[PDB]
Design an enzyme around this catalytic site. Structure first.
Site, PDB file in Angstrom:
ATOM      1  CD  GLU A  80      23.707  -1.811   2.222  1.00  0.00           C
ATOM      2  OE1 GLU A  80      23.312  -1.191   3.238  1.00  0.00           O
ATOM      3  OE2 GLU A  80      24.696  -2.572   2.254  1.00  0.00           O
ATOM      4  CG  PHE A  81      19.973  -4.579  -4.546  1.00  0.00           C
ATOM      5  CD1 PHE A  81      18.601  -4.727  -4.670  1.00  0.00           C
ATOM      6  CD2 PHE A  81      20.787  -5.623  -4.952  1.00  0.00           C
ATOM      7  CE1 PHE A  81      18.060  -5.893  -5.191  1.00  0.00           C
ATOM      8  CE2 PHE A  81      20.238  -6.790  -5.467  1.00  0.00           C
ATOM      9  CZ  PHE A  81      18.893  -6.923  -5.591  1.00  0.00           C
ATOM     10  CG  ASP A 133       5.755  -4.538  10.197  1.00  0.00           C
ATOM     11  OD1 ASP A 133       5.357  -5.491  10.910  1.00  0.00           O
ATOM     12  OD2 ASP A 133       5.472  -4.446   8.991  1.00  0.00           O
ATOM     13  CE  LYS A 157       6.291  -6.970   7.984  1.00  0.00           C
ATOM     14  NZ  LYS A 157       4.927  -6.930   7.415  1.00  0.00           N
ATOM     15  N   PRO A 158      10.748 -11.581   9.147  1.00  0.00           N
ATOM     16  CG  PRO A 158      10.658 -13.852   9.595  1.00  0.00           C
ATOM     17  CD  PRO A 158       9.898 -12.581   9.808  1.00  0.00           C
ATOM     18  CD  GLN A 159       7.750 -11.845   6.009  1.00  0.00           C
ATOM     19  OE1 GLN A 159       8.133 -12.669   6.840  1.00  0.00           O
ATOM     20  NE2 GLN A 159       6.702 -11.057   6.226  1.00  0.00           N
ATOM     21  CB  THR A 164      -0.958   0.008   1.196  1.00  0.00           C
ATOM     22  OG1 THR A 164      -1.559   1.306   1.309  1.00  0.00           O
ATOM     23  CG2 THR A 164      -0.223  -0.314   2.477  1.00  0.00           C
ATOM     24  CE1 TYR A 165       0.705   3.590   4.269  1.00  0.00           C
ATOM     25  CE2 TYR A 165       2.646   4.882   4.805  1.00  0.00           C
ATOM     26  CZ  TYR A 165       1.313   4.588   5.006  1.00  0.00           C
ATOM     27  OH  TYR A 165       0.587   5.295   5.944  1.00  0.00           O
ATOM     28  N   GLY A 166       3.918   1.815  -1.395  1.00  0.00           N
ATOM     29  CA  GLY A 166       4.741   2.106  -2.554  1.00  0.00           C
ATOM     30  C   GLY A 166       5.286   0.845  -3.186  1.00  0.00           C
TER      31      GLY A 166
END
Ligand SMILES: COC(=O)[C@@H](Cc1ccc(O)cc1)NC(=O)c1cc(C(=O)O)c2cc(/C=C/c3ccc(Cl)cc3)ccc2n1
Length: 274
Positions: free
Chosen positions: A70-71, A116, A118-120, A14-16
């Site tokens: 950073e990627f 927030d 989370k493993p993701q 929802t935020y981008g």
């Protein structure tokens, strides 16, 4: 942003939307998030820590809002899934927890909460690092599984302690290969926490009964013994985990103090195979 040649969509929400993108100038590869809409953030550009994905740029252009990070190629969720057969080695679990606690100590020392985890949202690289990402900075279906009880109880003002709770749930899940508290609703999330840790009262958590959403009619579950929670974590790890999942935000261990916990006396920095 014809300044970025977009490699692939890394994610929506929802935020981008976020893309892996190539800077046609730098040649550098970044994650680029475009927030659809309808300076404080830029202070974070100079707050850099090995264990926090770096914010490189914030751009307000053609009345659009872009954040540049950073990627990193992999996140902990994908890594746990590919490890589900084997599990993550305990020395690597210990290393990842130690590093996340360092990242959190750093942001908390600057009064920046994540809120927030989370493993993701946790990115790993080939050199054994793990980094905090997705701080929801855009706020001046989503999992409740890692949400601290004070948030679920509608507390308007939460502390750094909410991140410790979230990381404990992640610690447990890394160890058991199972989500600790897989609620499918806010009250289901709460009641799953209660059924394992016991329904909180003012005894263990003063002011719990004053939280906005607290109901005296919550079912009263006895606490289960921690031995079932995270087998086969040894006693140091269970001790640590118990202090991270303290009901009372003021008694829950801090990031700085967890770092000094005996569980980390033999911590190393193993390298994963990705
Ligand atoms: C994994 O998929 C995701 O969701 C990934 C996409 C992705 C991003 C980079 C990658 O390398 C790989 C994938 N993340 C985001 O969209 C996302 C969003 C936000 C936000 O706030 O909107 C982030 C905020 C920071 C703050 C940094 C900061 C905080 C406090 C301090 Cl003190 C200093 C610095 C760091 C990373 C962030 N990432």
């Amino acid at each position: 942003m014809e300044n970025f040649q977009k490699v692939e969509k890394i994610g929506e929400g929802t935020y981008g939307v976020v893309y892996k993108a190539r800077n046609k100038l730098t040649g550098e590869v970044v994650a680029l998030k475009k927030i659809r809409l309808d300076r404080e953030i830029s202070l974070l550009k100079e707050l850099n820590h090995p264990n926090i994905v770096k914010l490189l740029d914030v751009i307000h252009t053609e009345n659009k809002l872009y954040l540049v990070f950073e990627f990193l190629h992999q996140d902990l969720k994908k890594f746990m899934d590919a490890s589900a057969l084997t599990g993550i080695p305990l020395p690597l679990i210990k290393s990842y927890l130690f590093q996340l606690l360092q990242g959190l100590a750093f942001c908390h020392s600057h009064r920046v909460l994540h809120r927030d985890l989370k493993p993701q949202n946790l990115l790993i690289n080939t050199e054994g690092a793990i980094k905090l990402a997705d701080f929801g900075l855009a706020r001046a279906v989503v999992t409740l599984w890692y949400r601290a009880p004070e948030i679920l109880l509608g507390c308007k003002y939460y502390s750094t302690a909410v991140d410790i709770w979230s990381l404990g749930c992640i610690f447990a899940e890394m160890v058991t290969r199972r989500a600790l508290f897989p609620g499918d609703s806010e009250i289901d999330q709460l009641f799953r926490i209660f059924r394992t840790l016991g329904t909180p009262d003012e005894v263990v958590w003063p002011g719990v009964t004053s939280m906005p959403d607290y109901k005296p009619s919550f079912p009263k579950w006895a606490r289960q013994d921690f031995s079932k929670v995270v087998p086969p974590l040894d006693e140091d790890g269970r001790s640590l985990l118990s202090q991270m999942l303290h009901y009372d935000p003021n008694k829950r261990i801090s990031a700085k103090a967890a770092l000094a916990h005996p569980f980390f006396q033999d911590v190393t920095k193993p390298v994963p195979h990705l």
